[PDB]
mmCIF file of C-alpha atoms (C1' of nucleotides) and ligand atoms in Angstrom:
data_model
loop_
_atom_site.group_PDB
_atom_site.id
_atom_site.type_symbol
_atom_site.label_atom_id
_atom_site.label_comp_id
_atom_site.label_asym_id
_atom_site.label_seq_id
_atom_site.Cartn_x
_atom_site.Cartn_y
_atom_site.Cartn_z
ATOM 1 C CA UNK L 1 0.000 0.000 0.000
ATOM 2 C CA UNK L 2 2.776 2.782 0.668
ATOM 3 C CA UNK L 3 5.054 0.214 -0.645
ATOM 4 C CA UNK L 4 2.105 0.430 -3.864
ATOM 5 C CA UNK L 5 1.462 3.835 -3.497
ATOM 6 C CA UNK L 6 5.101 4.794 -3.306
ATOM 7 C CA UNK L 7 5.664 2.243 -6.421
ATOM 8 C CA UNK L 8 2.639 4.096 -8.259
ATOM 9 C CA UNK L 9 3.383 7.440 -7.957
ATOM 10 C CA UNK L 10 7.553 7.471 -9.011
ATOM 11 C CA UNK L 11 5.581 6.377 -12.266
ATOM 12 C CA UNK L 12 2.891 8.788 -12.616
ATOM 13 C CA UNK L 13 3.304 11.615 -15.338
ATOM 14 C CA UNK L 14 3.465 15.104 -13.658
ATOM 15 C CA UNK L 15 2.076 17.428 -16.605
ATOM 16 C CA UNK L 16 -1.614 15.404 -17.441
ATOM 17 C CA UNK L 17 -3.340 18.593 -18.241
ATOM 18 C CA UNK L 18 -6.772 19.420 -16.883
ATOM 19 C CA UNK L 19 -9.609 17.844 -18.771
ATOM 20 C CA UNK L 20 -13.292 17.032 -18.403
ATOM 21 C CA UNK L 21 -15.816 14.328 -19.818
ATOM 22 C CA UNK L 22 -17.061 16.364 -23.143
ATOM 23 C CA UNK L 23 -14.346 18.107 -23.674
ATOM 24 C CA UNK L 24 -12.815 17.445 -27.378
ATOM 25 C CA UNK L 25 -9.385 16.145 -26.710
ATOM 26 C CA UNK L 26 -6.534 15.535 -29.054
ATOM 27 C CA UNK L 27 -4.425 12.479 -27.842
ATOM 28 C CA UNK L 28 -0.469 11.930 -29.423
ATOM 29 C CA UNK L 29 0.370 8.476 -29.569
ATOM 30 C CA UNK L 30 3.846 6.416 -30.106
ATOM 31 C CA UNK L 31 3.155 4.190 -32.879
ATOM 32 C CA UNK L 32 5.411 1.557 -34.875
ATOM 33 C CA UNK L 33 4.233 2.498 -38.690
ATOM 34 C CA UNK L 34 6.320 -0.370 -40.436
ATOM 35 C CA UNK L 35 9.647 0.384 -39.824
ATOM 36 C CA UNK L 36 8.863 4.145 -38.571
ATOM 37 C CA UNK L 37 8.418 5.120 -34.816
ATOM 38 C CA UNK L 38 6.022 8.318 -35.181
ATOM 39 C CA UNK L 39 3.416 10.065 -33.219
ATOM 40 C CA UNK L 40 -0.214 9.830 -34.365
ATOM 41 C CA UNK L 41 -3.127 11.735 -33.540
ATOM 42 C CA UNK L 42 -6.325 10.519 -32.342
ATOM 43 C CA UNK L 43 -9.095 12.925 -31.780
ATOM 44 C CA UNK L 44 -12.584 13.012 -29.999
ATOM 45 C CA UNK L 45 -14.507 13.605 -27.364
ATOM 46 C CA UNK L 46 -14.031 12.482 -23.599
ATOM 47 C CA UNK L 47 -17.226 10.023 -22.641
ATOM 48 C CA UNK L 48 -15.582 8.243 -19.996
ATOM 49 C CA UNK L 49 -13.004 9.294 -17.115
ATOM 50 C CA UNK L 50 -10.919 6.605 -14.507
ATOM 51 C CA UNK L 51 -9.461 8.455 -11.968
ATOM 52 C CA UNK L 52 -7.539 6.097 -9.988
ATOM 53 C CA UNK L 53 -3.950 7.318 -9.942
ATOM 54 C CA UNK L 54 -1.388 5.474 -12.088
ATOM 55 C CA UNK L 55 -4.791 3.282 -13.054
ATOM 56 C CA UNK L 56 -6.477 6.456 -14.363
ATOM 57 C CA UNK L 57 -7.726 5.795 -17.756
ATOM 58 C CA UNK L 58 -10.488 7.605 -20.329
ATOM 59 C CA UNK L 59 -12.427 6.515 -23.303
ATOM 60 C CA UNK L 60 -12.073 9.198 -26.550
ATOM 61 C CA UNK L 61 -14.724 8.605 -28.852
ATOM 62 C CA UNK L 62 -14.650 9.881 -32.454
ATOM 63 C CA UNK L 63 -16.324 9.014 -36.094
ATOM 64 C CA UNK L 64 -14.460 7.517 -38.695
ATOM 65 C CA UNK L 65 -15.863 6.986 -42.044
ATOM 66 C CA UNK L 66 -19.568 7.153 -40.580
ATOM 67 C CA UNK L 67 -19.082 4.651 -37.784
ATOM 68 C CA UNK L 68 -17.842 5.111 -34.006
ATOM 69 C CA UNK L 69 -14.412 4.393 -32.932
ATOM 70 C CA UNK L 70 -13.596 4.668 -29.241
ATOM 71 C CA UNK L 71 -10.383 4.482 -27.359
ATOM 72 C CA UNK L 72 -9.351 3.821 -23.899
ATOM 73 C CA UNK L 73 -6.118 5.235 -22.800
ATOM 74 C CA UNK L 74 -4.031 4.583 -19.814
ATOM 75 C CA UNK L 75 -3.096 8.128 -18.843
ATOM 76 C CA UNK L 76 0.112 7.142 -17.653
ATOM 77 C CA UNK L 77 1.465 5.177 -20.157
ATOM 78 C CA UNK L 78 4.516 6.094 -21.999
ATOM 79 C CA UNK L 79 2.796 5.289 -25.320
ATOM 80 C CA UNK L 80 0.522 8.413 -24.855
ATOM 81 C CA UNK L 81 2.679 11.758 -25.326
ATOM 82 C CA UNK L 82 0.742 14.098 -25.176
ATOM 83 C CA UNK L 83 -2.662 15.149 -24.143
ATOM 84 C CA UNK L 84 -4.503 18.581 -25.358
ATOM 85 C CA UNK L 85 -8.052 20.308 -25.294
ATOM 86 C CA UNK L 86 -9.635 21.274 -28.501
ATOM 87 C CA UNK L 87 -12.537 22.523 -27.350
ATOM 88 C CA UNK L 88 -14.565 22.581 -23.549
ATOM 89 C CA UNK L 89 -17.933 20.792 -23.365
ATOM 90 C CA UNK L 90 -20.805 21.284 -21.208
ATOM 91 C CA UNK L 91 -22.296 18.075 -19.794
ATOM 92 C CA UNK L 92 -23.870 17.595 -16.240
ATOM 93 C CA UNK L 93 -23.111 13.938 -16.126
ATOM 94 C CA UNK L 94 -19.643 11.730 -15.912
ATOM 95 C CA UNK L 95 -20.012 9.127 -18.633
ATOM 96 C CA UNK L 96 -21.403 10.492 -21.838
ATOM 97 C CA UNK L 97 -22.501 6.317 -22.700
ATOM 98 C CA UNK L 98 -25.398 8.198 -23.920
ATOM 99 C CA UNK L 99 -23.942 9.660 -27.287
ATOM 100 C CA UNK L 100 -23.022 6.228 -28.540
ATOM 101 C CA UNK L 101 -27.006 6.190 -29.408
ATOM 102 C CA UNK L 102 -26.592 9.606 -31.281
ATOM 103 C CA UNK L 103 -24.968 10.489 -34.568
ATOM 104 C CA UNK L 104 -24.174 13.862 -36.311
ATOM 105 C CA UNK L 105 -26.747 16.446 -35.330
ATOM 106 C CA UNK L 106 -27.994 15.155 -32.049
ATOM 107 C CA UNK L 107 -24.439 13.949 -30.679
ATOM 108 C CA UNK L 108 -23.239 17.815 -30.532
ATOM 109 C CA UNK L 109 -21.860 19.426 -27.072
ATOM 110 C CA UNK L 110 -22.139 23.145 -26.505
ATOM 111 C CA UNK L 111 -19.276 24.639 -25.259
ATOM 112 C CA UNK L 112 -18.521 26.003 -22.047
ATOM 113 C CA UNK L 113 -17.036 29.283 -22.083
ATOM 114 C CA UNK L 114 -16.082 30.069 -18.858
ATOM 115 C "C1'" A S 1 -92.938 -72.720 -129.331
ATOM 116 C "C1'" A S 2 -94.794 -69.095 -125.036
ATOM 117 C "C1'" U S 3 -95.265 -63.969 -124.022
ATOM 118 C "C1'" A S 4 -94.918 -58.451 -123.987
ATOM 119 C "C1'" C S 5 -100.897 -54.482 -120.534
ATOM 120 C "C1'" G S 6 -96.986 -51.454 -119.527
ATOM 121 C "C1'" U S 7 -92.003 -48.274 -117.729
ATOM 122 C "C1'" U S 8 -93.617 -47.687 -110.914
ATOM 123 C "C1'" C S 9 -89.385 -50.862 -109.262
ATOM 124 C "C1'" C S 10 -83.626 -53.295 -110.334
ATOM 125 C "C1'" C S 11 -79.255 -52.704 -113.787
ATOM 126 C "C1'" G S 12 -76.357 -49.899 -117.997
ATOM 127 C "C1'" G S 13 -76.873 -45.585 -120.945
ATOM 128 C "C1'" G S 14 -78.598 -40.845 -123.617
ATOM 129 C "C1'" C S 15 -80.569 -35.556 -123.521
ATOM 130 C "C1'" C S 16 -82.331 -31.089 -120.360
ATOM 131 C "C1'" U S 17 -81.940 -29.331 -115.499
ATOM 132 C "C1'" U S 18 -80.194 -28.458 -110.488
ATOM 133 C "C1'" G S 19 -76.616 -28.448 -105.947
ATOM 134 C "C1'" U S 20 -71.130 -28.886 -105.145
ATOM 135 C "C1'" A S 21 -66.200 -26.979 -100.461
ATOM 136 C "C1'" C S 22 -65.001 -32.376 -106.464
ATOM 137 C "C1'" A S 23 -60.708 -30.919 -111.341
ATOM 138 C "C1'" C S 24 -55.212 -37.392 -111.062
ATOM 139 C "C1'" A S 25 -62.698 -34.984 -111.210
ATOM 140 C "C1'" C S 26 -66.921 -39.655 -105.300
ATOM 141 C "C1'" C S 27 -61.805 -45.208 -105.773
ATOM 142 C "C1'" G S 28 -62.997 -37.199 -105.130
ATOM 143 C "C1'" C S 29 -62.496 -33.683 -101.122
ATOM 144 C "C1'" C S 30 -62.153 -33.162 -95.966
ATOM 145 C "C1'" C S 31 -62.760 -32.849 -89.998
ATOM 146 C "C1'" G S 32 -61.199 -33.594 -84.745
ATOM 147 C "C1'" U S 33 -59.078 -36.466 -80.697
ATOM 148 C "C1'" C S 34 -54.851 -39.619 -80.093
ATOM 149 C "C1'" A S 35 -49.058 -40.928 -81.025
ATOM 150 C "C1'" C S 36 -44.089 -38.781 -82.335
ATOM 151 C "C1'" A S 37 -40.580 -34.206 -83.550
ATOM 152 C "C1'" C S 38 -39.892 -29.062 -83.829
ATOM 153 C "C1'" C S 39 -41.258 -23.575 -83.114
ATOM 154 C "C1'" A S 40 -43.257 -19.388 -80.612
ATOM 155 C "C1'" U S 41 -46.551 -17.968 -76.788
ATOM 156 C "C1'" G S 42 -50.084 -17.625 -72.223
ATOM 157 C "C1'" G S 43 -50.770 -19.278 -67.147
ATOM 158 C "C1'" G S 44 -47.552 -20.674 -62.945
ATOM 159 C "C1'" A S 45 -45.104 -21.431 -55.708
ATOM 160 C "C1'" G S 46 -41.588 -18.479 -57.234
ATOM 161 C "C1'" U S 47 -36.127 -16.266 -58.518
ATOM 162 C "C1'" G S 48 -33.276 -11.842 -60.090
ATOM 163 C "C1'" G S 49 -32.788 -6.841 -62.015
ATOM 164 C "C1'" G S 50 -34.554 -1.592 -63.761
ATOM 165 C "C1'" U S 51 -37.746 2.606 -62.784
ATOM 166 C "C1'" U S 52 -41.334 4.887 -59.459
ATOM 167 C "C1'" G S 53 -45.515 6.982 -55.464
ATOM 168 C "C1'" C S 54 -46.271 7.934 -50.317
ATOM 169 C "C1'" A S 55 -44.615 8.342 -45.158
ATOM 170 C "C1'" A S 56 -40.840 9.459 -42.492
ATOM 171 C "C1'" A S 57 -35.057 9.370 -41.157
ATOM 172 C "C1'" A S 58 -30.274 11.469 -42.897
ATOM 173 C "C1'" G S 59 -27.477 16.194 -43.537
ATOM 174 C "C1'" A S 60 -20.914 16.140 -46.598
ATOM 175 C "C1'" A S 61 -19.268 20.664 -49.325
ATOM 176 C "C1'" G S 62 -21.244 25.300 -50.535
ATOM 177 C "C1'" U S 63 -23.832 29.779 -50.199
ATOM 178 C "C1'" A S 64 -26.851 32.916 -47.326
ATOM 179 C "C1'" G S 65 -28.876 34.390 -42.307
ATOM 180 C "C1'" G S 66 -27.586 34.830 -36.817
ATOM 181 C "C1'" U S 67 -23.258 35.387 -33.657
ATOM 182 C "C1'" A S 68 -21.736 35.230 -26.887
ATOM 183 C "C1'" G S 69 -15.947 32.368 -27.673
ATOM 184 C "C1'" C S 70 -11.025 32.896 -30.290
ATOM 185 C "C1'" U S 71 -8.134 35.887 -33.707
ATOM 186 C "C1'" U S 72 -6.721 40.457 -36.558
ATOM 187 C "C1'" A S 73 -1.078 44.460 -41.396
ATOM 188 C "C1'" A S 74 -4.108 48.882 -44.443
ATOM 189 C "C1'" C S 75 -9.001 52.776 -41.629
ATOM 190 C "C1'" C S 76 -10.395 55.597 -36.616
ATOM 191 C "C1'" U S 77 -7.695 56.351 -31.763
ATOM 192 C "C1'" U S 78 -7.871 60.330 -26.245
ATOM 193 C "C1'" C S 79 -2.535 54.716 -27.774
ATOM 194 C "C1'" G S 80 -6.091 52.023 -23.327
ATOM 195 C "C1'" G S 81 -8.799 50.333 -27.301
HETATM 196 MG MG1 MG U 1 -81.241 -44.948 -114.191
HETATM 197 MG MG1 MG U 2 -44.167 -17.198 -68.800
#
RNA sequence: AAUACGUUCCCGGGCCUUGUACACACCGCCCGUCACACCAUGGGAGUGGGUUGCAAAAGAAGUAGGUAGCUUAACCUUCGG
């Protein structure tokens, strides 16, 4: 437990920036392409957050080619580079499940602006 | 030797006439089922395409309307905007 915690936390990336379920987040990832080693980007919107320390996770979901592709990170991995917010959403709840039943018009977030 | 009134009836034939789908001409012509082969076609549980009405759903790019957020060399500035 502080043997854990103390394992956890030498671990745990210092500079996660703030972010927020409906937010629209752009996520830098280490990826083998072939031969290459090269960042990618993977943008959406956060539906899902796991705050649990070097555990803490969250889902990005984003259309591709008409149909939903979602991704769960772990925060702390070393494959994830970088994290940054597009754009702030306004949501009242924690897990946005409900948007995987929208599309297009409906699945829009207003932004918060403040 | 017998017998013949007579021509209604049988058979062959002649002339006039009539009907005919016959003309290798009534031993003529021709009809439908059935059997066999071929052709095209209709129906047929269905099978596969084209086009189309109605009821809704969808909403890329563009253009126009609105515009709190972000951003801005030329004009205004009392230099803050
Ligand atoms: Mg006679
Ligand atoms: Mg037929």
């Amino acid at each position: 437990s502080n043997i854990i915690k103390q394992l956890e936390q030498e671990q745990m990336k210092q500079d996660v920036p703030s972010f927020r379920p409906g937010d629209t987040v752009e996520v830098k990832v280490w990826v083998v392409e072939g031969s290459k080693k090269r960042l990618q980007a993977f943008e959406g919107v956060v539906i899902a957050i796991r705050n649990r320390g070097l555990h803490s996770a969250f889902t990005v979901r984003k259309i591709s080619n008409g149909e939903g592709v979602e991704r769960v990170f772990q925060t702390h991995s070393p494959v994830v580079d970088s994290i940054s917010v597009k754009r702030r959403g306004a949501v009242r709840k924690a897990k946005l499940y409900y948007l995987r039943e929208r599309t297009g018009k409906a699945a829009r977030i207003k932004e918060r602006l403040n």
